[PDB]
Design a protein around this ligand. Structure first.
Ligand SMILES: CC(=O)N1CCN(C(=O)c2ccc(S(N)(=O)=O)cc2)C[C@@H]1Cc1ccccc1
Ligand SMILES: [Zn+2]
Length: 257
């Protein structure tokens, strides 16, 4: 098993998942003096249908909002891609306190939380499972969340959490377009990287937004109040789930701007 505790956490993952020491691991620190502007990058285009929102689920180390992904109702296009990618879930990462909690960092600066909106390459593959292990299989938009003013777009998500307090609980979560959560500029960095937790496959093209979104200190507390144990056991809050940044090992981070 794996987690974010001391015994099962990021520093220990490589014992069970050797790819943890691979060449394309995420997240990374983006050094802006080392990024390469690429004029071939097109703008990011998202087009999500709120009827594809399906279910919210407590997965023990985090929670996920999943989407119906049987057709191209909800898709990401543009940026570095020539293929359309189909939305399947979004989720967040956060830290023990407001001082850290993002996965990616920008010039060494840690944000409080990070939103991941994850998609799979339905142009080349027939399912998420096929795509998830392929170098071109996944595309995840990362948005850095800076502690400050309450973010009212987070509301439906946060209101839903009281129905999924313990590990394994799930609930319908419908009629929601997560492009409402993205910042108003979609200027971005991109690099080839991985899932940021086991199984750690190096299958993700990262799209990291330059503009942050807000989150209040009390909104972050609602995340940390989720519990990682199952109903009826001793309560164990989900205090953090961000992985430390990993070595670029020669990759280049490109900039759209
Ligand atoms: C079971 C299993 O291995 N799963 C399903 C759950 N899962 C995610 O949803 C996911 C987690 C983190 C990130 S991140 N933080 O990199 O954006 C993005 C997506 C991981 C991973 C995908 C996956 C799906 C199907 C087959 C193999 C792999
Ligand atoms: Zn994530």
């Amino acid at each position: 098993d794996w987690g974010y505790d001391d015994k099962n956490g990021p520093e220990q993952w490589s014992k069970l998942y050797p790819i943890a020491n691979g060449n394309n691991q995420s997240p990374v620190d983006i050094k802006t003096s080392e990024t390469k502007h690429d004029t071939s990058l097109k703008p990011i285009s998202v087009s999500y249908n709120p009827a594809t929102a399906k279910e919210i689920i407590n997965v023990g180390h985090s929670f996920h909002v999943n989407f119906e992904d049987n057709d191209n109702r909800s898709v990401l296009k543009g940026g570095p891609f020539s293929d359309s990618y189909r939305l399947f879930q979004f989720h967040f990462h956060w830290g023990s306190t407001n001082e850290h909690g993002s996965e990616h960092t920008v010039d060494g600066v840690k944000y409080s939380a990070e939103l991941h909106v994850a998609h799979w390459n339905s142009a080349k593959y027939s399912s998420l499972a096929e795509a998830a292990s392929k170098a071109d299989g996944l595309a995840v938009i990362g948005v850095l969340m800076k502690v400050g003013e309450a973010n009212p777009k987070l509301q439906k998500v946060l209101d839903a959490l009281q129905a999924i307090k313990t590990k394994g609980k799930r609930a319908p979560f419908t009629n929601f377009d997560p492009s409402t959560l993205l910042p108003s500029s979609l200027d971005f960095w991109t690099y080839p990287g991985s899932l940021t937790h086991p199984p750690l496959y190096e299958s993700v093209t990262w799209i990291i937004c330059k503009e942050s979104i807000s989150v209040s200190s009390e909104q972050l507390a609602q995340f940390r109040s989720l519990l990682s144990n199952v109903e009826g056991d001793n309560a164990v809050p989900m205090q953090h789930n961000n992985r430390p940044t990993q070595p670029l090992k020669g990759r280049t981070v490109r900039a759209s701007f």
